[PDB]
Amino acid sequence: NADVGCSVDFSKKETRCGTGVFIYNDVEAWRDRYKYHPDSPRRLAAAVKQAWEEGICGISSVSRMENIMWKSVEGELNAILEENGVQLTVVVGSVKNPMWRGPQRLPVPVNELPHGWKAWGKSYFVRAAKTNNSFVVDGDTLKECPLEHRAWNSFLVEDHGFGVFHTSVWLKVREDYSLECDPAVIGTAVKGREAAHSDLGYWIESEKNDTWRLKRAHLIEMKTCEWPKSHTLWTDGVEESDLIIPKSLAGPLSHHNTREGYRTQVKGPWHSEELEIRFEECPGTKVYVEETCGTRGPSLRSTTASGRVIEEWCCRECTMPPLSFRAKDGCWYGMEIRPRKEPESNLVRSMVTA
Amino acid sequence: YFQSNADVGCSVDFSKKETRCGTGVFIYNDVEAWRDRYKYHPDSPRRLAAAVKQAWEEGICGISSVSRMENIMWKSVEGELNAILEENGVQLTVVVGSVKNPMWRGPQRLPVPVNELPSYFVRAAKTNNSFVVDGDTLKECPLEHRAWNSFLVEDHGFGVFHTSVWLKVREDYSLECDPAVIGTAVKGREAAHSDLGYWIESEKNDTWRLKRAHLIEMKTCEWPKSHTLWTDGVEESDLIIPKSLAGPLSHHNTREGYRTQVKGPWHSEELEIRFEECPGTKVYVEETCGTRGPSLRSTTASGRVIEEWCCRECTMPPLSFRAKDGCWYGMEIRPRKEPESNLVRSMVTA
Ligand SMILES: *[C@@H]1O[C@H](CO)[C@@H](O)[C@H](O)[C@H]1NC(C)=O
Ligand SMILES: *[C@@H]1O[C@H](CO)[C@@H](O)[C@H](O)[C@H]1NC(C)=O
Ligand SMILES: *[C@@H]1O[C@H](CO)[C@@H](O)[C@H](O)[C@H]1NC(C)=O
Ligand SMILES: *[C@@H]1O[C@H](CO)[C@@H](O)[C@H](O)[C@H]1NC(C)=O
């Protein structure tokens, strides 16, 4: 509440300074400035060892930055485990979207794993030998560790740390059970006729038109924790079935997360690595409102597998401009928006149900 | 023109341990700033004059300003409005007085003038008909015949020494506070609900709760839920700053062991809500205490400190209000031994 800053205020036509609350868009910024780090690698190693002994065979990361943290500390955790004679290998793979919940939780260990004080030699520097027992973090590893035996949402941000090139975000294993997204990295603000619900992976803009409505959003992850109402604007009398970004995808439970003529986009292209929600026709396409249209269904891409653009689309009672998702492989339409003449079986469809 | 999600700036971020720049949303504390950097101005003095003239002809005899900034605007345009009215042969004089708190509602509304009228230096003779804005004028123009909340901010305008805020007479009837000048933000463990008169801080303890507030006006419009955090499951009787005093309808405007402070010292020109003992006093939680009543000041009218206070089931540190005349206690907190009849009490009920 007591940060000091200066800014160009475009809506108030002034450049000024003062104290206040400043919410930065670090989602769309090309500069990477935050890195997650364990509060204590030796304590995290002990939590992993205990988790494994309790039948927790791996991790489903909540967020893109958690997976990056696991990848950067993998070698260190394995060296600590080997230093203590623990036959266990942390194996960190890629994130797949959506980042589905797991039901287990890392335990808080009483003690960290200590230093071994082994003879001076290459063991202080080289990676640990691979073992028979893989503690798998994300990756394509469901056969060896099914999702129901993985821990998810076990961390809380303990503090931020100063750094010259990156700002550290220290993560600690929490004691409490929670489904909620970590509020330490959430920033939500409204000013005049625009608002943003944000964290390190979601930048969700709303605006006052005739009513408040979703304006645009950019998501560089697809997480499944619950966005906390404490950090959400205008939460009363909201119907979850009207929330554009579903609750089950960390959508804010807010009138700001709604748009007339659209219901919750549970079958959007949430397999995508990142998505922009934009109310605008896909390139080369037109949408027509007509009750004869097909019904809501899986989101469809505007281009076929061969690259052919589908020119004409419809929706039974949605509103213009149309809801679209912009992804690396092209432009996708809201669930309401179906091809007008083309069979849907010729198109690329979302296989995800959030 | 009205986009505020893409400002650019730099800041010292104490909780994230960084000084950095970027794009985003910046919510400034303009309440506790050293100066007024904003000035309300009518979008058109001549249009406002026409609205006043027609209002007078409809039996609206004056104005109750919604905000401190609106009253300052009326004072600045008074002479010009009266010149315009005199130029058009209208036997009417706008008379602007000071604001009293609370700035109570009125049920009338300025009309959007059907016919427009066809100056900054003219010294208009006073007429026999007074259109009174605020002031100690309730006898000649009762509250039930005054317009209130008739303006909407149309736009901001650049200025070297002050940023202009242009006000237009609105068509629609509303009780809502103008959202054009509201900023609300939460980041991590702290939040603020703010406009040009209220700075309301909340924090995450075991639960989210009111931390502190600074108010430089006491207004009575409704704080819009659109600009409010966490509005569901809220009991309005738990809102520390009452709904009827533009309190946000939020869990952030609550504090365990206190209910809504309808009889706080809202006649104050400015106040700080602070959870802290009044100087030289102690509060004991004990069931033998008196029940909730009008807020009492910690000092007698002659400045003597009442040392020992109690509450039946409030929480420590105690809810207090800091004003120019001293330190006042939340409704729950009563003198432990001294009779209340010896103390200074709030006479207002929000
Ligand atoms: C590791 O696994 C092999 C089988 O591939 C097994 O024979 C061996 O005993 C194991 N090593 C241990 C348990 O130390
Ligand atoms: C609302 O949005 C529509 C289309 O998105 C636009 O044409 C219209 O001007 C807007 N109305 C407002 C901002 O009052
Ligand atoms: C002026 O108003 C007073 C009432 O305050 C009235 O008694 C008087 O007759 C009026 N004089 C005029 C209209 O010349
Ligand atoms: C809550 O505030 C009290 C003081 O009122 C403080 O002692 C305590 O540490 C705080 N608890 C948390 C969880 O911040």
Curated annotation (Swiss-Prot), chain A:
Cleavage, annotated site positions: A2, D3
Locations listed in the record: Secreted; Host endoplasmic reticulum membrane
Signal sequence segment: none
Post-translational modifications reported in the UniProt record: N-glycosylated. The excreted form is glycosylated, which is required for efficient secretion of the protein from infected cells.
Ranges per topology, Lumenal: 3-354
Lineage: superkingdom: Viruses
Residues with glycosylation annotation: N132, N209
Disulfide bridge map: C6-C17, C57-C145, C181-C225, C282-C331, C293-C314, C315-C318
Bilayer disposition of the protein: Peripheral membrane protein
Subunit structure: Homodimer; Homohexamer when secreted. Interacts with host TBK1. Interacts with host USP8. Interacts with envelope protein E. Interacts with host HSPA5.
Stated role: Plays a role in the inhibition of host RLR-induced interferon-beta activation by targeting TANK-binding kinase 1/TBK1. In addition, recruits the host deubiquitinase USP8 to cleave 'Lys-11'-linked polyubiquitin chains from caspase-1/CASP1 thus inhibiting its proteasomal degradation. In turn, stabilized CASP1 promotes cleavage of cGAS, which inhibits its ability to recognize mitochondrial DNA release and initiate type I interferon signaling.
Name of the molecule in the record: Non-structural protein 1
Organism: Zika virus (ZIKV)
Part of the intact protein present: 790 to 1142 of 3419
